[PDB]
Point group: C2
Chain length 190, copies 2
């Protein structure tokens, strides 16, 4: 097997917790238990990555200097793991199925950065293009955290994900950044 680097593990942890928090808010906004389940699965991945980070750090360091440095990484991962647990706490509320105060969904839809649901029509120019080819985060500011395609979810889609008419994109971004993408998705803006 090809060994992983500390940086690769660390980057995945950071990237994953960010996605986790976004998905946690999405689960609350949509009262969606499947999204909530995904958050919990990611919390487990975070525990696994944290374990590997500790293993790598323990094995890599043999003297005091090296030790002091790997400890800084473990300390940061520790804080990251706390954020993952908080996202999991939010997800659990959705799985418990509690009736949320109406202000909650409004809050997620009206803050600086919001979560939006975008319907893709056949006439849109993004149909048939991949997220990478598109680089939506780069070119629209809207970051796609998930896609609902029929009876299935694609969480954290990669650059190879090709968009189809009928897809429902779950994006994170500013309000005007979400409405802009909706225009493009409706084919209004070519």
């Amino acid at each position: 097997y090809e060994p992983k680097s500390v940086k690769e593990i660390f980057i995945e942890m950071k990237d994953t917790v960010e996605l986790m928090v976004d998905l946690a808010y999405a689960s609350l906004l949509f009262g969606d238990k499947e999204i909530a389940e995904e958050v919990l699965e990611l919390e487990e991945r975070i525990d696994l990555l944290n374990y590997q980070l500790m293993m790598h750090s323990v094995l890599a360091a043999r003297n005091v200097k090296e030790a002091e440095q790997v400890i800084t990484i473990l300390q940061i991962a520790n804080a990251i793991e706390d954020i993952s647990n908080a996202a999991g706490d939010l997800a659990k509320m959705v799985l418990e199925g509690v009736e949320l105060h109406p202000v909650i969904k409004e809050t997620i839809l009206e803050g600086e950065e919001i979560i939006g649901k975008i319907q893709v029509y056949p006439e849109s120019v993004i149909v048939g293009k991949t997220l990478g080819e598109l680089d939506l985060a780069t070119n629209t500011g809207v970051w796609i955290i998930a896609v609902r395609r029929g009876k299935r979810w694609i969480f954290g889609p990669n650059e190879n994900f090709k968009i189809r008419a009928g897809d429902v994109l779950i994006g994170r971004g500013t309000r005007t950044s979400i409405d802009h993408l909706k225009e493009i998705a409706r084919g209004a803006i070519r």
Copy 2:
């Protein structure tokens, strides 16, 4: 005095913790103690907002139904407050001045979303424009979390913030989203 709504307090909490985490990573990337100090000040604001949220929730609810609903809000704020404490943990490492493992700065610069430093030249078209007039988050995907102007910091600048040549923008976004803004900032792209 004009009373605040639960939603206003809640939105500020959510917005603030997001900014806190971004600033925490910025403090680590730049080994900047002033940014770290700002994170700690925001952790205190979060404690204050949490207090006001509890006050509003306690006063607003008088019967079981209303109580069950305000509790959902308090439960979410509880998780948000945990995230704020994690950001504060990261900031403290910078204030302690520990020597960070080199992988840390690399990780912040190479993940899905990174933190970038952008120099604004006199010839750039963004000079003299406000963040609102510009709506950078909306129009570039790059979210401006802070600006270093001479010997002073402006954290979480509002829509009225007018950009000047010599400003150093601290942005959050994708790599290609950061390089794009740098082009605009250098005047290369009008």
